[PDB]
């Protein structure tokens, strides 16, 4: 039925491994400026906790989440309210170390994401996550890079949303 539940999720995913900050590189999507954006993941029972820091003029926001585990490792659920409907997330494809391909699914709408424990991605990385996107039926046109310059990992009380 929905795109997203025939995307394959990472075989045994390990949440302890995927924990700690990763970049976010790029989103390919149809829908719809980029803000530098990092991760904060922790395990938390069989689900993640995801703490979203962005910049933007020259301040520090960070969006608390929970990515609620569905039953099959690696596909998790982003609870819908005050913002906009229920997001689905897989984790596809992830060495644990050095790259994270993602596909979210609102409304509806699959859209594929790239993230990096550091920069540069590497060329094997980059070429893959192009090579999905095709496969997602969305062009390089389709492709927004975020910003590699101006990340943030700590915002103060004024600057935090919890939505858990």
Same mark, same amino acid.
Request: proline share 2%; charged share 25%; no cysteine.
């Given at each position: 039925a929905s795109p997203i539940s025939?995307? @394959?999720?990472?075989?045994?995913?390990?949440? @302890?491994?995927?924990?700690?900050?990763? /970049?976010l590189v790029a989103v390919g999507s149809a829908? $719809? *400026?980029? %803000?530098?954006?990092?991760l904060h993941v922790a395990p938390q029972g069989t689900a993640m906790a995801v703490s979203t820091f962005r910049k933007l003029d020259g301040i520090c926001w960070q969006? *608390?989440?929970l990515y609620g585990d569905t039953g099959v490792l690696g596909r998790f659920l982003l609870?819908? $309210? !005050?913002?906009?409907?229920a997001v689905h997330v897989v984790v596809a494809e992830t060495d644990y170390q050095s790259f994270a391909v993602l596909?979210? %699914? $609102?409304? !509806?709408? /699959?859209?594929?994401? /790239?993230?990096? *424990?550091?920069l540069p991605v590497s060329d094997s990385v980059l070429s893959g996550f192009e090579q999905r996107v095709q496969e997602a039926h969305l062009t390089e046109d389709q492709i927004f890079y975020f910003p590699k310059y101006g990340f943030c990992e700590a915002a103060d009380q004024f600057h935090v949303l919890d939505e858990v």
């Open positions: 025939t995307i @394959q999720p990472k075989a045994n995913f390990d949440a @302890q491994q995927f924990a700690g900050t990763w /970049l829908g $719809r *400026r980029a %803000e530098a954006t990092t969006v *608390r989440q609870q819908a $309210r !005050g913002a906009r409907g596909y979210l %699914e $609102r409304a !509806g709408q /699959l859209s594929v994401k /790239l993230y990096a *424990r550091s």
